[PDB]
Design an enzyme around this catalytic site. Sequence first.
Site, short mmCIF file in Angstrom:
data_model
loop_
_atom_site.label_atom_id
_atom_site.label_comp_id
_atom_site.label_asym_id
_atom_site.label_seq_id
_atom_site.Cartn_x
_atom_site.Cartn_y
_atom_site.Cartn_z
N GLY A 1 0.56 -1.36 -0.17
CA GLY A 1 0.07 -0.08 -0.08
C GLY A 1 0.95 1.31 -0.26
N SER A 2 0.31 2.19 0.70
CA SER A 2 0.74 3.66 0.56
C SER A 2 0.23 4.69 1.70
CB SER A 2 0.65 4.45 -0.79
OG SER A 2 0.58 5.75 -0.82
N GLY A 3 -1.25 4.38 1.62
CA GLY A 3 -2.30 5.08 2.14
C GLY A 3 -2.63 6.36 1.59
N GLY B 1 2.85 7.84 2.45
CA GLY B 1 4.28 7.57 2.28
C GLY B 1 3.92 6.39 1.20
N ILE B 2 4.74 5.42 1.29
CA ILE B 2 4.78 4.17 0.41
C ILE B 2 5.24 3.10 0.89
CG2 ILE B 2 5.70 3.03 -1.80
CD1 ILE B 2 5.35 5.93 -3.01
N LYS C 1 8.18 1.59 5.14
CA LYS C 1 7.94 2.84 4.34
C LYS C 1 8.64 3.63 3.96
CE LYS C 1 3.95 6.40 5.33
NZ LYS C 1 3.14 7.28 6.25
N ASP D 1 -7.35 10.94 11.80
CA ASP D 1 -7.55 10.30 10.38
C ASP D 1 -7.68 8.79 10.57
OD1 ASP D 1 -7.92 10.16 7.74
OD2 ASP D 1 -5.89 9.92 7.37
O1 MYU Z 1 2.07 -3.56 8.45
C1 MYU Z 1 1.38 -2.75 7.80
C2 MYU Z 1 1.74 -1.33 7.86
O2 MYU Z 1 2.55 -1.07 8.78
C3 MYU Z 1 1.21 -0.42 7.13
C4 MYU Z 1 1.25 1.06 7.10
C5 MYU Z 1 1.02 2.05 6.09
C6 MYU Z 1 1.04 3.29 6.09
C7 MYU Z 1 1.78 3.80 7.30
O3 MYU Z 1 2.02 4.99 7.59
C8 MYU Z 1 2.13 2.91 8.24
O4 MYU Z 1 2.95 3.38 9.48
C9 MYU Z 1 2.04 1.47 7.96
O5 MYU Z 1 0.22 -0.69 5.79
C10 MYU Z 1 -0.12 -2.18 6.00
C11 MYU Z 1 -1.30 -2.38 5.17
C12 MYU Z 1 -1.76 -3.73 4.75
O6 MYU Z 1 -2.77 -4.15 3.83
C13 MYU Z 1 -1.07 -4.84 5.51
O7 MYU Z 1 -1.66 -6.03 5.38
C14 MYU Z 1 -0.09 -4.62 6.66
O8 MYU Z 1 0.39 -5.38 7.17
C15 MYU Z 1 0.33 -2.95 6.70
#
Ligand code: MYU
Lengths: 10, 351
Positions: free
Chosen positions: B27-29, B32-33, B49, B145
Amino acid sequence: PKRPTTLNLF
Amino acid sequence: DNNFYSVEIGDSTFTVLKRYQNLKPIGSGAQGIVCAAYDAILERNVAIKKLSRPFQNQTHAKRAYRELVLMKCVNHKNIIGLLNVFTPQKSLEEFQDVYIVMELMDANLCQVIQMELDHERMSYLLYQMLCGIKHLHSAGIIHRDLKPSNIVVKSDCTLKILDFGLARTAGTSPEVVTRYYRAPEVILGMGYKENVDIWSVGCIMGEMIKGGVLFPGTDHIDQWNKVIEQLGTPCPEFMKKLQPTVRTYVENRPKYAGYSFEKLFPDVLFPADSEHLKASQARDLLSKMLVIDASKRISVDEALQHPYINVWYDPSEAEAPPPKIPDKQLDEREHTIEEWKELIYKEVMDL
Ligand SMILES: O=c1c(O)c(-c2ccc(O)c(O)c2)oc2cc(O)c(O)c(O)c12
Ligand SMILES: [Cl-]
């Protein structure tokens, strides 16, 4: 109640 | 040097410690990425990230700091655990990007909503979510958020909160929080206390139950309609608390009755009421979270006592020592691009 230990993520 | 290497994931390039391989995009949200990868020392999955030129913009660095600092010193089981921070560049001179390594969970809530869950499960996931949040609150920090895609879970049914890029103490009077989850406080011009997160929580729970987004507005304005169509039109005392110019639009909006929680959330949507932990009992919690008026709205502490959540109450998990924020680092002081670049590198460089 018992806490769950299980989640179907498939 | 000889300690790193580079991989080409899509357009983005991951220049990372040799320890970390078999990287894959997850992902990214938006902050970040992220790649999941295999730590070879520790022989376990992690999440990395990347933060490209975080110093480049002033908001772009505000988030990186927030994240970095919070990640360093947060200590809760319902919050993603930090594993490592690093930078591929040799000294401040050529310094570009930061990488944060943290636990790998199994998936995010998105694919839980499309599930049907029992009360045991759902309520407990929510109980976790709350503790996790409570931890941030107990330092006066607000997540700001929370959303499906910022919540992660594992197959032992455990939950964690992540992405603190937007995290802050209370604020006043540029919408950066995600449309659907925006609190009324946030939609309108108002300042926010912490129960702004309870609104998000309401939004999320409601979603799990709905199997879909609760207030699905087409644009940043329609989103208010979406709320008021649903829960009714604010009472005049709430209306008073508004900025004069937008006070006028809100008054001018149609005076919706807005449906009762029992029509908002019919029983066809729930499973079945085991040992109480009931349709109503939840509905009531919803009915106490999704409150337009922030001052009239339930807090975390209270959400934690509320019967439907309360059956998992563990004070070692609930009243945990709050995280220690290195003294007056939050104080949003608005620095130069130059000052920023340095601040961060000092947080990356601990070794
Ligand atoms: O572990 C993460 C993670 O740290 C992130 C993540 C994503 C954005 C951040 O800012 C952050 O600190 C952590 O995202 C995901 C997304 C998933 O679908 C998943 O199965 C995950 O296990 C994770
Ligand atoms: Cl089961």
